[PDB]
Design a protein around this nucleic acid. Structure first.
Ligand code: K
Ligand code: K
Ligand code: K
Ligand code: K
Ligand code: MG
Ligand code: MG
Ligand code: MG
Ligand code: MG
Ligand code: MG
Ligand code: MG
Ligand code: MG
Ligand code: MG
Ligand code: MG
Ligand code: MG
Ligand code: MG
Ligand code: MG
Ligand code: MG
Ligand code: MG
Ligand code: MG
Ligand code: MG
Ligand code: MG
Ligand code: MG
Ligand code: MG
Ligand code: MG
Ligand code: MG
Ligand code: MG
Ligand code: MG
Ligand code: MG
Ligand code: MG
Lengths: 394, 181, 46, 102, 336, 124, 238
RNA sequence: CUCCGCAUAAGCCUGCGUCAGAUUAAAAUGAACUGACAAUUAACAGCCCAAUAUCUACAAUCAACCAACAAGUCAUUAUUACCCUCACUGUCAACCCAACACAGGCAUGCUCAUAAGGAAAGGUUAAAAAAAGUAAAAGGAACUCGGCAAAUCUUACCCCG
RNA sequence: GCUACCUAAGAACAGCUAAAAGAGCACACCCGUCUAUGUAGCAAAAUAGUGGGAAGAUUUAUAGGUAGAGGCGACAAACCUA
RNA sequence: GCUAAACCUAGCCCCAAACCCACUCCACCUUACUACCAGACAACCUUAGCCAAACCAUUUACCCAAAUAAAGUAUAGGCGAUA
């Protein structure tokens, strides 16, 4: 059919050899002994030259197939830059989990009373928004790559101010620059998750279980949805040079091994570079699944069966204005089949912390129509953010 | 220290400073290489004190006390550098037989004139070097006419020079006619 | 309008247009340098 | 050294050493006010501040904390009786600061 | 055109130059403790400091290899960022002020002031009076802002029997270079932000100013100079910006002192400083009759740990950790 | 209006021109990513300065000296002084062969040496 | 001149590629086509005109799902993003194509004809007579070179000895094999020919420069010319 | 008075800094001319990057409602290789292109009326003609090819496009 | 390096009205309608005033491309170093 | 009486003879006079016209390997100019 790449841009064919190289028993006279080109002499043929010594700045890696860690069976890797096509529906099949709209009742009951709310909650959250978007920098209008991390770190700092009421909040830290890995199979497909970027709220005590035993045994009737013709491994990095290995990100002995909450940020100014709502919720599900699966294998070995003590990992993904909440529970490590017990996941979608923010006063016909500040601020969104932080400590 | 850049304090302000002779190339052919390597730095420090005094004399708009001192040291530094290079050149002829320490070759440039090309140090062979192969060491046939025009230019100069000398000699007998012999 | 200011100096343009490398690029530019070498020019090119 | 070829270096090669250096420096009086620790020199163009340090420490046993260099342009304005411009040689200036409070 | 003053500087004896640019007198030690009329568990804080320290060095697994020049921005920067976050959550019960406090990571601080005059030497403006302008563009690793102002260390009229250094040459010989760009007076946030008062800064010296590189350059006596040169400039620019936010300036000098703290470290060694802004009138027209001067207190650089081997921290020093707590424990005096 | 008869220097041209041109100083390293320069300790010339303590020679020589003639050193002059005596002794002893020329001082090749004679790889 | 073409990419991708304009100039640098210059910048989106292109590990008829029908600044028609298996590619959208539809791409020539749905791709010998088609190819595997423009459509006239008679939009007949793949239906943007430029400036946004002001006298080439439809063009070798 | 001014880029290349002067400006203090001496110091800026394969549908506009076409300037991963580190260059001025110490030409940022930068008068007299302005009795286009110019702030129509 | 057209990647456009604009008023900026002056001048095409346009087919810096039997041209036989 | 006036060398021209033809180190085809990195671009091809023919259109001398002579002869040529 139509081939890509015009011949004018391709490398020109090497010049045809001189006819003296076709006559046997005849040595050609070349300019190799002159150490420079001349038109009236034959072009010599030099042998392949090798440097003979190592030089990092001029290194040439060997061919792909020669790499030690080379397998014919491909491994589809999911990383932070992968943008799934079918969104959550495709993540619910890769992880073999069931979706449940709305957060668990237990988690929401933490901030249901007026006892755990923060002093001047409504007024303190409004100052984290204005600071991040108005007062943070010298520039008039801060960029999203600048205020998305700040509006999250400050919300954590505000939720960490309730150590006076709950002394069990001093057994947790917020790690940065952490990575984790996790490998598993789904219907004869080698899958791997490599988590990176974001903040990892670590703890000393593991989170309790949400669903009861009867709720875990009732997932045997649920059927995973399919999206034929689209394949479940679309928009994943199909790698043939990999190494099946599991990693939590820390060595044996770390005081805070148990992951509590993963904070993922869509801090990109251009809209095309930012994930879509459904795409960001899928990254949250897979990263939570990869961190819970990394603890299960370390604790219960590298076998495949139904876990006796399911692992629970939370996650919060934000674009700076919108927040998504997740509560993932690992119920089994036998995912190759589509039948049997399945994992659980509670999700809140499209929870706006504020509708819009005016950094400058809107003056129409010499009349201030909209003053500087947030618009459509919703306190309910922060109550859910605070409930996830208080889970396992109150 | 920084006291070696200036002359003995007592000598400051004097208009003359007695000094000895300059090292001759023959007096240095008796000393060892280790002794010549030590003397080079004794003369180097004396040369810097003289260059520092020569510049401060211009600053103060006064004449240097003994300018010959600097000329003597420079002559000694050159003589010493001649001896060492002489021993190295002779030692290279015995082990290798080469008359030049740096490689080179005779080549024609793009302009068609003969030139001695001094080689440079490279990490890759010459057939792989992008920049070396853009350089041309051959003249095309449109140069022959300019080579002749440049040869005829040199011949005219050499002819005027030879005819001028004959004239001066012929005019040098009119006033001194006793030079016929 | 007023003329005479056609020369707007630019070293990049000057070295790329009348430079030594561009003279030697073509056979006609090599003959330019040869004529200036024959005449005795103190400057052969920019 | 100046006006000499430098032996090329490759990874794992010997250290480059000069046994006889032809760099000749002249200490000069500053035209403007300078700190007490600061010293001023006139050095050749090919010389680097790294060389001036090792050159001073080794030959004159002077510890130096910092070295800064600048290139000074020499006026090509002067013209002779043939209206041909005369060039004052461009030279390099070095500012050296002593180490131990000297 | 204004001089660019870098707190983290490579210039020799810059601290003595910065004292004259800010009219500041440096004193050794810490300020006089106020003799005025909960349980602090050291064992818990020690474990934390060693946990964050061991985390970045040993427990945390790096994906790619870490080079020597990348250590400050990959190992020491996160540790300092993490040590402060956890210590403010463990000291909030002991200091409520830290609860409603603003914690900033790598936020810029700007201050623009005029000190002195010069006679233009050359040009069409030769022989005319020009003012010497300075600008500090500082970005501390961390800093804690609060709504209420801390209490002074000494009175405003307080004066020491020590003279301020004076230079005989021009600042260009430090070296110091001039440039013309936007003048900024920034505490870390805009004026609308209620948290306009400074509590404590945390700085991390870059790899270029590392201790081991200063011993190779025969600059062992400049090790402590780099520490107190950053404080004098970083704290003067911070306190001075707080006063401008309140409306004070050269003509309308401060009526009350403005104080702040700073912790200067290179990853292993730590130094502690305290700064008090007594005067802000530094121009010739206003500094002519001014009696009073700004003050800075500073300690010697001491290591927090002797060596870190595998998951064991060797020679951990608790006195350095206790000093970090005292700064964070300090709070604004409460009203009756 | 350009001066084509003036020395081309780094002070002339736009910013990209002025940074790429130098003054003749040899390099001591390379530029890495981020415009970070890496200095090579082996590329910096190390000054080999000797001990000048108890050194008799001085910058000048007294005038009370003879006017000895100049005898430029030649390869033949150096062979007879150093190499010939050892050969004559072995010739008289009766044990001399070309194979042992390396023992007398001859160098078959220059490779594997720190200071090669051609092409020389050391500074003056 | 130092002219290099922008069409250098050798691997297919759906990412918009940045291309540079020509101004009506060839590699020599001289004008070869007048009236071309300027206009809004555009990014090229590779179009796969070979509908039936099974994946590397797959063979036989496959199905794709339509994701997005969007505007293309490099052509008069609209393009659609389809995804089958693990890959994604751009194609030419038909009149009626929406996000969510499932298109079929087959090369099977059954004994009997098949019910033709718009957007589906079948060979010429698997469609009934009178069916509208677009994006036909001269020979199998050549790629669709005809009936690509907005609203354009052909029609299948008859089948003879493994050969299909196609009527082009110019009311000219073309003969090809029955194994050549074509797409059913019309092309999108049926009302493209009914657009109004409105002002001269809008043609400068499309990369069109004004005509020359020189006055030309007409010759004998001008004037209505009623000549017969040319013969049928056959790409089948007998 | 303020037509600006300060800075950057570009260009230029020591071209009003000190000492001296028989040189010089209308000007025998000044000096851009001559001779000698001195001077611009990196953090700003310039000078960058190991290989192979692979990834990159969803504008911007306070980006949130909303509405568009002319359809847009910013992103990776996998494996391999890789422990020495702050070199080199630009940094002056009253400045460039117009034969001139030319009423011309000259991109960007800030200042938007200045905190910066400047002087229309060599002295006198107060003729014509000429130039640039201000005021004007009564009349108000009678001027003139034409309401040109000035003043003032106005109606309607035609030809061509 | 002027100019004509083009390529690559950049920059600028207050305020008012309408908020739709190859829309209007009107700075910067671009152009050069009429008048006077100037005519070896400040200037080998300028000065003052008055004027046209000023979110677009706009203006503009940088580098590159098209060369004389030619190029370029919204054809004025324009422009391609007075 | 000023301004000026006056000079004899510098060297140059035409022949003859003889063939002619570099250098301290360092730098120089990239923006020449720039210490140091993966290249493969390569040279050849009738001169035309002014002019003369009183226009112009075929045509119109141009060292080509020994001075002289044969000889401006044979011969060519809008059988013209001229060669
Ligand atoms: K200049
Ligand atoms: K003018
Ligand atoms: K003023
Ligand atoms: K004629
Ligand atoms: Mg410098
Ligand atoms: Mg289109
Ligand atoms: Mg198009
Ligand atoms: Mg038309
Ligand atoms: Mg027409
Ligand atoms: Mg820099
Ligand atoms: Mg300057
Ligand atoms: Mg005047
Ligand atoms: Mg007068
Ligand atoms: Mg009059
Ligand atoms: Mg009147
Ligand atoms: Mg009338
Ligand atoms: Mg009337
Ligand atoms: Mg009349
Ligand atoms: Mg009028
Ligand atoms: Mg019209
Ligand atoms: Mg221009
Ligand atoms: Mg373009
Ligand atoms: Mg506007
Ligand atoms: Mg308009
Ligand atoms: Mg208008
Ligand atoms: Mg035009
Ligand atoms: Mg016409
Ligand atoms: Mg005409
Ligand atoms: Mg004729």
């Amino acid at each position: 059919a139509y081939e890509w790449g015009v011949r004018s841009t391709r490398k020109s064919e090497p010049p045809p050899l001189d006819r003296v190289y076709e006559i046997p028993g005849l040595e050609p006279i070349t300019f190799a002994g002159k150490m420079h080109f001349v038109p009236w002499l034959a072009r010599p043929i030099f042998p392949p030259w090798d440097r003979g010594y190592k030089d990092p700045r001029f290194y040439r890696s060997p061919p792909l197939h020669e790499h030690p860690l080379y397998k014919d069976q491909a491994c589809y890797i999911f990383h932070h830059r992968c943008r799934l096509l079918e969104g959550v529906k495709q993540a619910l099949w890769l992880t073999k989990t069931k979706l449940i709209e709305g957060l668990p009742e237990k988690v929401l009951s933490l901030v249901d009373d007026p006892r755990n709310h923060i002093e001047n909650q409504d007024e303190c959250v409004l100052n984290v928004i204005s600071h991040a978007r108005l007062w943070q920098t010298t520039e008039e209008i801060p960029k999203r790559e600048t205020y998305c991390p700040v509006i999250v770190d400050n919300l954590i700092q505000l939720c960490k101010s309730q150590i006076l009421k709950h002394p069990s909040l001093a057994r947790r830290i917020c790690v940065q620059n952490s990575t984790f890995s996790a490998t598993w199979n789904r219907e004869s497909l080698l899958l791997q998750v490599r988590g990176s970027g974001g903040a990892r709220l670590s703890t000393k005590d593991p989170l309790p279980t949400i669903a009861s035993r009867e709720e875990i045994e009732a997932t045997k009737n649920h059927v995973l949805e399919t999206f034929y013709p689209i394949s479940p491994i679309i928009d994943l990095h199909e790698c043939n040079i990999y190494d099946v290995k599991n990693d939590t990100g820390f060595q044996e002995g770390y005081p805070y091994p148990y992951p509590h909450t993963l904070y993922l940020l869509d801090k990109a100014n251009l809209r095309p570079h930012r994930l879509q709502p459904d795409q960001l919720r899928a990254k949250m599900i897979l990263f939570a699944f990869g961190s819970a699966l990394a603890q299960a294998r370390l604790l219960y070995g590298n076998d495949a069966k139904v876990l006796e003590q399911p692992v629970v990992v939370q996650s919060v993904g934000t674009d700076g204005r919108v927040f998504h909440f997740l509560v993932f529970q690992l119920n089994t490590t036998d995912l190759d089949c589509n039948e049997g017990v399945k994992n659980l996941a509670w999700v809140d979608s499209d929870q706006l912390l504020y509708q819009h923010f005016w950094c400058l006063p809107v003056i129409k016909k010499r009349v201030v129509v909209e003053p500087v500040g947030p618009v459509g601020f919703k306190p309910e969104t922060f109550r859910k953010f605070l409930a996830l932080y208080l889970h396992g400590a109150a | 220290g920084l006291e070696e850049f200036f002359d003995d304090p007592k000598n400051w302000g004097q208009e003359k400073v007695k000094s000895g002779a300059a090292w001759t190339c023959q007096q240095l052919r008796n000393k060892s290489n280790e002794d010549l390597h030590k003397l080079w730095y004794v003369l180097l420090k004396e040369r810097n004190m003289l260059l520092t005094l020569e510049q401060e004399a211009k600053r103060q708009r006064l004449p240097m006390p003994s300018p010959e001192r600097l000329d003597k040291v420079v002559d000694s530094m050159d003589a010493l550098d001649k001896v060492v290079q002489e021993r190295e050149d002779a030692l290279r002829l015995l082990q290798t037989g080469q008359e030049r320490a740096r490689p080179g070759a005779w080549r024609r440039d793009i302009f068609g004139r003969i030139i001695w090309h001094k080689f440079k140090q490279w990490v890759i062979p010459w057939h792989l070097n992008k920049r070396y192969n853009r350089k041309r060491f051959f003249a095309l046939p449109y140069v022959d006419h300019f080579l002749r025009l440049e040869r005829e230019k040199r011949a005219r100069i050499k002819a005027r020079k030879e005819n001028l000398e004959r004239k001066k000699a012929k005019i040098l007998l009119k006033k001194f006619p006793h030079l016929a012999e | 309008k007023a003329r005479g200011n056609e020369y707007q100096p630019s070293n990049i343009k000057r070295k790329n247009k009348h430079g030594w490398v561009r003279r030697l690029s073509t056979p006609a530019g090599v003959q330019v340098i040869l004529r200036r070498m024959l005449k005795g020019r103190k400057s052969l090119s920019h | 050294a100046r006006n000499v070829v430098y032996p090329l270096y490759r990874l794992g090669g010997p250290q480059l050493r000069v046994f006889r250096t032809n760099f000749f420096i002249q200490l000069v009086r500053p035209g403007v006010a300078q700190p007490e620790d600061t010293v001023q020199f006139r050095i050749p163009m090919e010389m680097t501040r790294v060389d001036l340090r090792n050159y001073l420490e080794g030959i004159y046993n002077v510890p130096v904390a910092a070295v800064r260099t600048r290139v000074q342009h020499g006026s090509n304005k002067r013209r002779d009786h043939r209206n041909v411009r005369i060039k004052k040689p461009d030279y390099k200036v070095a500012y050296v600061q002593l180490a131990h409070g000297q | 055109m204004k001089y660019m003053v870098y707190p983290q500087t490579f210039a020799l004896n810059a601290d003595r130059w910065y004292q004259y640019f800010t009219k500041t007198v440096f004193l050794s030690g810490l300020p006089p403790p106020p003799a005025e009329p909960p349980a602090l568990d050291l064992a818990a804080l020690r474990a934390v400091a060693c946990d964050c320290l061991l985390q970045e060095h040993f427990y945390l697994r790096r994906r790619r290899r870490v080079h020597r020049y990348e250590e400050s921005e990959v190992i020491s920067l996160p540790f300092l960022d993490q040590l402060v976050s956890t210590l403010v959550g463990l000291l909030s019960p002991h200091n409520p002020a830290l609860a409603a406090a603003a914690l900033d990571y790598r936020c810029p601080v700007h201050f623009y002031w005029v000190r002195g005059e010069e006679i233009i030497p050359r040009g069409h403006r030769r022989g005319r009076i020009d003012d010497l302008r300075y600008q500090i563009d500082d970005k501390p690793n961390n800093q804690i802002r609060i709504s209420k102002q801390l209490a002074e260390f000494v009175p405003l009229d307080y004066s020491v029997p020590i003279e301020i250094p004076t230079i005989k040459c021009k600042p260009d010989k430090l070296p110091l270079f001039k440039r013309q760009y936007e003048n900024h007076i920034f505490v870390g946030s805009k004026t609308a932000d209620p948290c306009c008062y400074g509590h404590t800064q945390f700085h991390l010296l870059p790899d270029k100013l590392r201790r081991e590189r200063l011993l190779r350059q025969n600059c062992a006596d400049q090790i402590e100079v780099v520490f107190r040169a950053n404080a004098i400039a970083s704290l003067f620019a911070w306190t001075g910006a707080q006063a401008m936010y309140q409306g004070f300036w050269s003509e309308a000098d401060v009526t009350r002192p403005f104080v702040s703290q700073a912790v200067i470290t290179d990853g292993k060694y730590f130094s502690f400083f305290c700064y008090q802004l007594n005067t802000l009138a530094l121009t010739t027209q206003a500094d002519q009759n001014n009696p009073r001067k700004n003050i800075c207190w500073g300690t010697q650089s001491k290591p927090l740990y002797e060596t870190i081997e595998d998951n064991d921290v060797k020679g951990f020093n608790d006195d350095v950790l206790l000093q970090i707590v005292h700064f964070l424990l300090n709070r604004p005096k409460e009203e009756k | 209006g350009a001066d084509r008869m003036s020395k081309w220097t780094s002070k002339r041209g736009p910013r990209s021109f002025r940074g790429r041109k130098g003054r003749g100083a040899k390099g001591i390293g390379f530029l890495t990513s981020g415009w970070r320069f890496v200095q090579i300790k082996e590329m910096v010339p190390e000054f080999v300065v000797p001990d000048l303590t108890g050194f008799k020679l001085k910058p000048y020589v007294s005038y009370l000296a003879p006017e000895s003639e100049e005898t430029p050193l030649t390869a033949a002059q150096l062979f007879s002084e150093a190499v010939a005596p050892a050969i004559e002794k072995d010739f008289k002893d009766g044990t001399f062969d070309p194979d042992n020329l390396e023992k007398y001082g001859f160098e078959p090749t220059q490779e594997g040496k720190l200071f090669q004679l051609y092409p020389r790889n050391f500074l003056r | 001149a130092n002219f290099v073409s922008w069409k250098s990419r050798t691997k297919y991708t759906i990412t918009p590629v940045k291309m540079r304009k020509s101004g009506g100039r060839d590699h020599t640098g001289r004008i070869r086509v007048h009236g071309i210059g300027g206009g809004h910048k555009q990014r090229y989106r590779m179009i796969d005109f070979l509908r039936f292109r099974p994946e590397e590990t797959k063979s036989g008829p496959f199905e794709e799902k339509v994701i997005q029908v969007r505007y293309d600044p490099c052509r008069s028609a609209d393009i659609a993003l389809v995804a089958g298996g693990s890959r994604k590619r751009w194609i030419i959208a038909t009149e009626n194509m929406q996000a969510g539809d499932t298109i079929l791409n087959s090369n099977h020539i059954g004994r009997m004809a098949v019910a033709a749905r718009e957007g589906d791709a079948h060979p010429l010998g698997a469609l009934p007579v009178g069916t509208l088609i677009n994006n036909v190819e001269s020979e199998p595997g050549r790629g669709a070179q005809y009936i690509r423009a907005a609203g354009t459509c052909g029609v299948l006239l008859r089948k003879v000895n493994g050969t299909a008679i196609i009527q082009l939009p110019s009311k000219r007949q073309m003969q090809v094999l029955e194994t050549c793949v074509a797409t059913v239906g019309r092309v999108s943007n049926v009302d493209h020919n009914k657009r109004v430029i409105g002002k001269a400036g809008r043609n400068r946004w499309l990369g069109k420069r004004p005509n020359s002001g020189r006055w030309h006298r007409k010759g004998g080439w001008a004037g209505r010319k009623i000549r017969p439809l040319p013969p049928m063009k056959s790409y089948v070798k007998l």
